[PDB]
Each structure stands twice: as structure tokens, then as C-alpha cells.
């Protein structure tokens with residue numbers, strides 16, 4: 097079916113929402129054994145929890161710390177985008193508009209709002225606020 | 240002689256001389272009051288042949304002037320306020336002494352420690368002068384309070400007198416003496432009381448809740464009552480947001496007195512009681528135009544192109560839509576109001592609707608309507624109950640008297656009501672909105688209190704297209720989804736399309752970008768003076784224009800599109816007059832008529 | 845301790861934070877913190893991160909203010925672990941309220957005016973949004989509301 101048209105009679109919901117992720121589960125014995133075995137590991141013998149803990153010794157964050165970190169970054173610094181990144185995103189969005197219009201010449205049933213652009217922006221500032229930097233970068237957006 | 244003058248008091252008065260003498264701004268202020276009374280005293284006497292007495296005093300001053308007297312008032316109001324009042328009374332008696340009272344102080348501030356909200360209050364702050372803000376509910380019924388008595392006595396003629404000291408008189412405590420109500424004078428003559436000689440002073444007590452927007456995430460609210468007397472009475476209705484400054488008292492005995500849990504009822508005396516503005520509530524424009532501002536307007540009124548600049552001043556963040564912005568101004572102004580002699584009145588204000596695909600900013604535009612609007616309440620879909628209605632609240636509140644609690648559209652009177660998702664709203668309500676919009680009044684027969692009360696509000700509404708994005712291509716009808724008379728009631732139906740183009744897209748992109756990296760302030764000030772000054776009336780320059788136009792519309796458009804009625808004509812006149820207000824012109828003009836023509840055209844085409 | 849979460853903290857936390865800001869793999873190691881249990885789904889996995897961190901917030905005149913940060917839809921058939929993942933975000937986020945409804949059970953989903961039976965008057969009854977203000981809200985069955 098058309099990707100939209102799912103929620104009630106109206107896609108407007110999906111329009112308001114910035115990042116929509118359709119998740120799919122297909123059966124692949126390789127991957128299915130991967131996920132399964134992973135869960136068997138999850139229950140007990142807690143081997144996964146252990147793995148998390150040596151991830152904590154070596155690298156990974158305790159998630160009790162992650163919280164405090166998030167609070168930190170959230171209050172301390174408010175990021176701002178760079179001009180070349182801006183024009184980059186202009187090119188981005190006009191290519192989106194043009195190309196996908198051309199796609200919808202056929203009345204292909206599905207979308208594009210400047211709200212989506214604004215989303216992309218907020219992602220860039222979010223991730224900029226990860227690096228904690230007061231300024232954005234191009235690669236940084238390229239992700 | 241009372242307790243005879245004491246140099247405690249003596250010093251406290253005398254020291255409060257130099258101030259107010261410096262800063263001298265008050266010394267003449269008092270004079271002014273006198274003046275205003277005198278003139279009006281001359282108005283009652285000669286022509287057919289008043290003001291409150293309290294004068295504001297900034298707390299800012301004392302810090303420079305007297306530290307101890309500052310710290311003293313704040314910390315001990317009881318001891319410093321009444322001598323101050325004494326002083327100012329003496330002065331006021333000096334200013335004009337010849338022709339023939341409390342003369343209270345405001346205490347503005349420059350607060351405070353002592354800035355605190357009714358949630359955080361007592362007992363360190365107890366018996367000190369406090370600034371407490373919040374919703375005012377439930378208010379109370381005003382009652383006159385008896386102070387002096389007068390009596391006639393036959394056969395000996397004469398007259399009499401009596402005085403009454405309440406627990407709340409003065410500030411500081413006093414050894415209470417009940418006076419009874421004197422009757423049966425000795426020697427044993429009867430006493431016929433007389434009224435109108437015996438003075439009264441009004442009395443009111445309003446309770447103040449803590450601010451709901453500044454409220455905690457969730458919890459019960461906790462409020463403290465306040466007593467208000469004479470000049471302070473009735474200033475604020477329930478539902479206003481109010482900053483109350485005044486003494487905080489312990490008054491009464493707490494069970495210690497009668498020997499045989501709860502204790503010491505506490506309440507706030509006076510004092511300032513400012514009504515103030517906060518989004519969706521309680522006026523308040525206000526505004527202060529001083530000397531210079533009004534001059535700026537006056538200069539700016541002559542320039543011929545101003546309307547377009549103004550219309551652009553609304554939208555820092557929003558493209559195009561110059562026509563719609565123009566509209567919102569033309570609602571802010573609104574065609575005066577005209578109430579015929581012994582006949583119904585024609586609707587002054589203009590109502591607007593916006594219909595288009597989402598992302599049209601329709602919901603984004605309205606908040607900016609709200610901010611600079613000077614009022615009014617916002618309402619989104621459902622919404623309700625009663626919307627504008629009093630709901631005729633049962634029961635009591637208090638003692639069993641049936642009273643009304645005003646809904647939005649009533650409370651929003653003389654203002655801009657917003658409606659979001661205007662389509663979603665139940666038809667049951669719409670039925671009432673018919674009565675609100677054109678007719679201009681609300682009618683409640685419910686149980687009950689049976690009254691016709693007035694809501695004359697201006698109205699905006701943003702409403703999604705019927706189904707999906709289909710608005711653009713879809714027919715002139717079946718697209719709106721909310722027949723029928725409503726479509727007419729709205730003076731202007733504006734349609735906006737989200738349909739996409741690459742060029743327009745780029746031009747979106749850059750401004751969006753710069754955004755993340757004619758000033759609004761002067762806008763509303765520009766507006767109020769325009770509103771109460773001055774109504775342009777109507778002129779024979781224009782009429783033939785709007786008549787030509789109107790007849791054109793009916794005759795040609797009834798082939799083109801719909802709906803068109805006399806209503807449209809009314810709207811023509813309102814728009815003309817509004818654009819006249821924008822021009823500040825004491826008259827309606829032909830150019831204006833042409834403008835109204837234009838916007839009503841872009842409405843239609 | 846939320847709400848009224850204390851924004852102040854000890855020095856060494858700034859120290860070790862500012863030590864974490866120096867990691868090249870910082871982004872990449874964070875994206876590995878969220879779902880120790882949940883396997884794969886890397887786009888979602890990163891999206892959570894960029895969600896929690898808020899975004900550009902602009903008070904610029906006129907009264908219009910743009911917002912942060914965004915929104916995320918996990919929609920899909922079960923075995924997606926999304927309903928578990930939300931419990932996780934709920935744990936991590938400094939102030940968070942998981943409400944799958946319709947609101948539940950007594951809690952309304954949105955700001956609601958209810959009256960104090962004694963004293964009458966009015967107060968905010970509570971709900972997801974209000975109690976959760978200034979942070980993350982987790983919703984399920986979002987079509988069922």
C-alpha cells in the first residue's frame with residue numbers, strides 16, 4: 097500500500113513527525129540465529145551484561161553517567177550552524193523538491209515539507225551539541 | 240491627646256520630609272490631585288447652576304535617600320508606614336490649606352526579598368510588606384462597612400456621633416473597644432438613627448492563587464486571601480492575573496484566648512493591587528506612549544507607502560502572504576462600531592478564516608496574532624465546554640446565590656479570539672458561534688440566570704481541508720467541509736496552497752537558513768492610539784466605488800463562484816473604515832475603498 | 845529529584861566530560877551505549893542519540909519561537925523491540941514520562957483542568973505533557989489515542 101495513508105484517514109500526523117522509521121523483520125537464518133543467540137545471551141548467564149561491563153572498563157559509558165552527561169551538554173552550550181553547511185543544505189532541499197516532484201509527475205502515491213528541512217537542521221545542531229562545539233561543520237552535516 | 244507624641248514617631252515623621260521633598264516629584268503630585276478635585280468641584284456647582292487620595296511612592300528612592308528607613312519599611316511596616324502617612328497628610332494639608340483623611344501610600348517598588356509568590360510564604364516573611372502575585376479567584380461580593388454613626392434626638396434636638404474601630408483599621412494593633420450601637424441616649428431619650436450623615440467605606444476580600452503557568456508540574460494550588468478597602472475595591476475581576484503588594488498580618492487570637500490545633504488566621508492588607516497582563520488573560524495593552532512615540536506615529540502617518548511596510552512587519556519568519564498579513568492588520572483595527580439610535584448596531588469588527596494544506600503556518604501564524612493582539616484568549620478545536628458561555632455554574636458559590644462564570648468569548652470581549660482546527664469543533668458549538676459572530680451577543684437561558692450578555696469579539700480561525708491535501712484542485716465547494724452560513728459569517732475566506740516549485744523552494748531555503756542565525760515593539764503602540772483615536776466615520780468619496788464593486792461581485796461572481804450576499808457589502812464597509820484607521824485619516828477615502836476591493840478580490844481570486 | 849533537577853555539579857564531572865569530548869569515536873561509542881540488549885537497528889540507534897541532545901532553540905523576535913528537538917517514529921510489526929527501547933530512553937533521559945495511551949491509568953495524556961473538590965477553584969490535573977515538560981515524552985499506540 098501507499099507508505100502514508102496508514103494513520104486513521106490522514107497522513108498529516110506523519111507530516112508533523114520529522115523522522116519516521118518503518119522497521120522490517122524478515123526471516124534470514126543467518127540473521128535470525130544472530131538475534132536469537134543474542135537473546136539467549138541476554139537472559140543469562142548475563143554474559144552480555146558482563147560484556148557491557150568490560151565495555152565499561154575499556155570504553156563504553158555506564159549509562160548512569162550518560163544521563164549526567166546529557167544534562168550537562170543540554171544546559172551548557174547552544175550550537176549554531178555554519179554558512180557553507182547552510183548553502184549545502186539549500187542544495188540538499190532543492191534537489192529533494194525538484195527530483196521528488198519529478199518522481200510525482202506520475203502521481204506516484206506517497207511528504208516534502210520545509211518542516212522536514214527544519215528537522216534536518218535540528219539534527220545538525222543536535223549532533224553539534226554532541227561534540228559540544230559552539231559551531232557546526234560540513235562533514236558534521238554530511239552525516 | 241491619645242498617648243501623646245513620641246520622638247520615635249516624631250523622628251519617623253520628621254525624617255520623612257527631606258524625602259519626599261527630595262525626590263520632589265511627589266510634592267506637586269499631591270497638588271495635582273487637589274487640582275483635579277477642585278475643577279470638578281467647580282463642575283458640579285456652576286455648570287448645572289473625586290479621585291482616590293493615595294499617591295504612589297517608589298521604593299527605589301529610599302535606598303539612595305535613606306537606607307534605614309527602607310530596610311525599616313520592608314522589615315517593619317507597622318512602625319514606619321503610619322508615620323509616613325501622617326507626614327504626607329500634613330503636607331497635603333499644607334499644599335492648599337484654605338478650602339475645606341488617610342491619604343495612603345502605594346509602595347511601588349523595587350522589590351524585593353520579599354518578591355515572593357504565594358506558594359512560598361510565611362513565616363519568616365510574616366508581618367512584613369510582601370509582593371504576592373497570581374490568579375485572582377474567587378473574589379467576593381462588595382459590602383459597605385459602617386464607620387461613623389449619627390442620631391437624632393427628640394425633644395432635645397441635637398444629634399450625635401460615634402466611631403468604630405475594626406480589627407483591620409490602621410495597621411498596628413490596638414486595645415479593642417466595642418461601642419455597641421448607641422441607642423437609648425442617657426438621659427433616657429430615644430434616638431432615631433439617621434443615614435447619609437453616617438459615613439461608610441466599602442469593603443472587599445479577594446483570594447489569590449499561585450500562578451498556573453508558574454505552577455509546579457502538578458500539585459494542589461494554595462491561595463491566600465487579601466482585604467481591600469475603599470479606593471482599591473472592585474479593581475479586578477475574578478480570573479485576572481494580579482500582583483498584590485501589602486502587609487501580611489497575623490490578626491486574631493489562635494485559640495490561646497478561650498481556654499477549653501488550627502491557629503492565627505492570616506491575610507494581606509491592601510495595598511497596591513496591580514492588574515497586569517499575561518498571555519490569554521486580563522487586558523493589558525496598556526500602554527505608555529510618552530512624548531516621543533506619538534510624535535513618531537504622527538510623522539509616520541503622512542507617508543503614503545506605510546501600509547505595505549506595516550503589513551511586512553508582522554512576518555519576520557514567514558514568506559509572502561502579504562495579503563493575509565494585510566488582513567490581520569485590518570482585523571486589529573476593525574471598522575469602528577456603530578450603534579444606531581433606538582435600533583440595532585451594525586457589526587464593526589472583521590472575522591477571518593484560513594484554509595490550506597498543512598505547513599501553511601496557519602497554526603504558526605496565529606500565535607503571533609496572539610502575542611501582539613492586546614488580548615485575547617486562544618481556543619483550539621475541542622476545546623469548549625461552553626466555549627464562550629457562562630455555563631451558568633451550579634451550585635451556590637457561595638451561600639446559594641446563582642452566579643455566572645464567563646467563558647472565553649465573553650472574557651475575550653474587545654479582543655482577538657483564535658480558533659485552531661476550526662473544522663474539528665462540534666456542530667453543537669458552531670450553532671452558538673453563529674449567535675456570537677454577527678449578532679454580536681451571547682444569550683443564556685439555561686436554568687437559571689436568564690440574560691443576554693455581550694461578547695463583541697473579533698475572530699480568527701485556521702481549519703484543515705476536508706480530506707488529505709486535496710484542497711488545491713478541489714471544487715470551490717465540498718472543499719470547505721463546514722457549510723453553510725459560517726462560510727458567510729467569516730468576512731474573508733483565504734485559501735493557501737502548499738503546492739511545490741523548485742524556484743520558490745530555493746527562495747524558501749535561504750530565508751529558512753538565515754533565520755536560524757517596523758520593529759515588533761512599536762507595532763502595538765502604533766495600534767492602540769490608532770484604535771481609540773480617532774474613528775474615521777464615512778465619506779461620499781468612496782461609496783460609489785464599493786457600490787460598483789459590490790454589484791460587480793454579485794452579478795459576475797454568482798456565475799464565477801459563491802457565496803455572495805449583503806454580508807459581503809457590510810464587510811466592504813468595515814474594510815474601508817479599517818484601512819482608514821491605518822491611514823489615521825479622520826475620514827474614509829476612495830483609495831481605501833480600492834484597497835478593500837483588492838483584498839476582497841484576492842479572497843475571491 | 846525531578847522536577848527541580850539540580851543543574852549544578854562537581855568539578856571532576858566537568859573534567860571527565862571534557863575528557864569525553866576529546867574522543868574521535870565519541871559519537872560512535874555513544875551509539876553503542878543505548879541498546880546493549882537490542883541488536884542492530886542502527887539508524888534508530890543513532891536517532892535516539894540525536895533526539896536526547898535537544899537542538900537549536902530560538903527566541904528571536906517576533907514572539908515566534910522555533911523548537912527542538914524533533915520527533916521519532918518507530919512504527920512497525922512486533923519484534924522491533926521499540927516498545928522496550930522506549931523504556932530504555934525513559935531510563936536514560938534526565939526527565940521522562942512513558943505513557944502509552946490514551947493516557948494511563950488514572951493519568952490523562954494531556955494538560956487538563958480539574959477542580960480541587962475542596963476550595964473549588966481550579967488546578968492543572970496533570971498528564972503526560974505537563975509533568976514531563978522540558979524533556980522527553982514516550983508514547984505508544986500513538987494511532988490508538
Ligand SMILES: Nc1ncnc2c1ncn2[C@@H]1O[C@H](COP(=O)(O)OP(=O)(O)O)[C@@H](O)[C@H]1O
Nearest residue numbers: 211214556557558596597598599600601602603
Ligand atoms: N512561510 C513560511 N516561512 C517559513 N517557515 C514556514 C512558513 N510556513 C510554514 N513554515 C514552517 O511550518 C511550520 C508550521 O507548520 P503549520 O503550517 O503551522 O502547521 P499547521 O498546518 O498545523 O498550522 C513551522 O516550523 C514553520 O517553520
Ligand SMILES: Nc1ncnc2c1ncn2[C@@H]1O[C@H](COP(=O)(O)OP(=O)(O)O)[C@@H](O)[C@H]1O
Nearest residue numbers: 135881882883884921922923924925926927928
Ligand atoms: N534486537 C533485539 N534485541 C533483543 N530483544 C529483542 C530485539 N528485537 C525484539 N526483541 C524482543 O521483543 C520484545 C519487544 O517487543 P516489541 O517489538 O516492543 O512489541 P511491540 O512492537 O508489539 O510493542 C522484547 O521482549 C525483546 O526481548
